[PDB]
Design a protein around this ligand. Structure first.
Ligand SMILES: CN1c2c([nH]c(N)nc2=O)NC[C@@H]1CNc1ccc(C(=O)N[C@@H](CCC(=O)N[C@@H](CCC(=O)O)C(=O)O)C(=O)O)cc1
Ligand SMILES: Nc1nc2c(ncn2[C@@H]2O[C@H](COP(=O)(O)OP(=O)(O)OP(=O)(O)O)[C@@H](O)[C@H]2O)c(=O)[nH]1
Ligand SMILES: Nc1nc2c(ncn2[C@@H]2O[C@H](COP(=O)(O)OP(=O)(O)OP(=O)(O)O)[C@@H](O)[C@H]2O)c(=O)[nH]1
Ligand SMILES: [Mg+2]
Ligand SMILES: [Mg+2]
Length: 389
């Protein structure tokens, strides 16, 4: 016997796509959460600019500034953090202060929510992730921006911490590249990386944008990611580079690319409760395979076998980042594998065996059980599986 799994993979009700794609409850929940973070962040910046405006108009003592700070949403930072914000506002000169009073944070989501590969989480501890970047248009800087790294990080933190203080079961986490709100009971977190971008170009592009529509991309090397730990405060990491690479890959390869990428992530979620290869390494390897190996989009069962066969080789050679400015590969080459990478290799080598043995199982029932060794017990309708012609 030979079974075909195309429907097992693609059926939008019962099949794997059916199990992975967010419910509307989940999708609207994520957008509502993002809206709440965006609102609070703009409010907090307005509150801080309010104080700075006061400083400009009349010379206010440091103590008066502290007092004013302690009355705003910034009160949700620790005591020493509040004093630091007051100190930073008190201490900036006319020029920096004028820049600050002209700053309004802007937002743009990146990651799987943006390019539509966000899967419903599988094991306990696994969470849906929305990556909403905050952008701070300021003058081009070589060393350090007019408005300080410290100040900007503190305000975004205050915004996030102020929301946690208003929501049972939310908690704040600081990561190296973002601030995070975790909502365990909803299996969700929102990440907020922060970027500096050129103010003049931002304005020019926004003016162009609004004039040319009725009812754009910045210079990549000036998109600066703020880093929270380490002595390097900023790194040139433009998230649009990955978004564009993936969207262009989808165009070039076809619409089955997003599906097979979801499947590989689902495989990952089933094989490890935490850990496994990154989502981006899986996408990059999969793109490389589909660009170079003949396949048929009308049988994702066959396509998934083709991918599984070639993944070990991709990862063994090291997976290069689509961002050539990246300082490391997305996955190291095999001569540099330690325990972590060896564990990944051994699971990848297992996958094509699982898919093969499912294909040659004795019944539809046994076929389902076998293939569910790769993706977990998510699909339950064995009648999705069809005897190959
Ligand atoms: C990213 N970006 C970027 C660029 N270039 C390079 N080289 N790297 C970059 O990272 N260019 C554009 C952008 C950076 N510049 C901008 C960033 C944000 C905005 C802005 O007005 N954001 C809106 C939200 C837009 C939105 O919801 N958008 C929705 C999409 C629309 C929708 O879903 O309705 C969303 O977040 O999903 C806001 O702040 O309220 C305007 C410009
Ligand atoms: N240049 C570069 N950007 C990265 C890297 N890892 C993550 N990013 C950026 O961060 C965004 C989100 O990354 P992840 O959350 O790991 O990946 P995801 O595609 O959202 O996957 P899931 O959250 O697992 O669904 C990506 O779209 C990239 O913009 C990396 O190694 N190099
Ligand atoms: N621009 C840019 N953004 C990134 C990059 N890496 C991560 N991000 C963003 O910051 C978020 C958190 O990044 P990470 O520190 O990689 O998160 P993580 O290590 O996967 O999470 P844990 O495994 O729980 O520590 C991501 O989801 C992205 O939104 C990067 O290289 N460039
Ligand atoms: Mg993500
Ligand atoms: Mg994230």
């Amino acid at each position: 016997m030979t079974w075909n799994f195309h429907q097992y993979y693609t059926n939008r009700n019962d099949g794997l796509m059916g199990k992975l794609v967010l419910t509307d409850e989940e999708k609207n929940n994520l957008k509502a959460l993002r809206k709440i973070i965006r609102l609070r962040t703009r409010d907090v910046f307005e509150e801080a600019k309010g104080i700075a405006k006061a400083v400009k108009k009349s010379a206010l003592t440091f103590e008066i500034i502290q007092e004013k700070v302690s009355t705003t949403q910034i009160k949700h930072l620790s005591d020493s953090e509040q004093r630091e914000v007051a100190k930073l506002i008190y201490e900036m000169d006319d020029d920096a202060r004028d820049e600050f009073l002209g700053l309004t944070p802007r937002f743009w989501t990146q990651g799987s929510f943006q390019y539509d590969t966000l899967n419903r989480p599988f094991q306990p501890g696994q969470e849906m992730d929305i990556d909403d970047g905050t952008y701070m248009p300021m003058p081009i800087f070589e060393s350090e921006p007019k408005i300080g790294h410290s100040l900007l990080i503190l305000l975004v933190d205050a915004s996030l911490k102020s929301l946690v203080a208003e929501n049972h079961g939310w908690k704040f986490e600081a990561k190296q590249t973002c601030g995070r709100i975790k909502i365990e009971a909803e299996k969700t977190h929102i990440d907020v990386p922060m970027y500096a971008i050129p103010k003049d170009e931002f304005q020019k592009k926004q003016i162009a944008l609004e004039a040319n529509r009725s009812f754009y991309e910045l210079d990549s090397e000036n998109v600066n990611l703020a880093l929270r730990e380490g002595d390097r405060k900023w790194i040139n990491s433009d998230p649009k580079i990955v978004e564009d690479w993936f969207n262009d890959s989808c165009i070039r390869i076809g619409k089955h690319l997003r599906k097979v990428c979801r499947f590989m992530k689902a495989w990952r979620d089933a094989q490890w409760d935490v850990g496994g290869p990154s989502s981006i390494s899986l996408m990059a390897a999969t793109v490389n395979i589909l660009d170079s190996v003949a396949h048929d989009a009308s049988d994702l069962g066959e396509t998934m076998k083709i991918i599984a066969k070639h993944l070990p080789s991709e990862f063994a050679r090291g997976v290069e980042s689509p961002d050539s400015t990246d300082e490391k590969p997305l996955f190291p080459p095999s001569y540099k594998h330690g325990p972590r990478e060896m564990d990944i290799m051994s699971k990848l080598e297992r996958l094509p065996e699982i898919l093969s043995s499912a294909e040659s199982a004795d019944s539809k029932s046994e076929a389902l059980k076998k293939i569910n060794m790769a993706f977990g017990n998510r699909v339950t309708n064995s009648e999705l599986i069809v005897l190959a012609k």
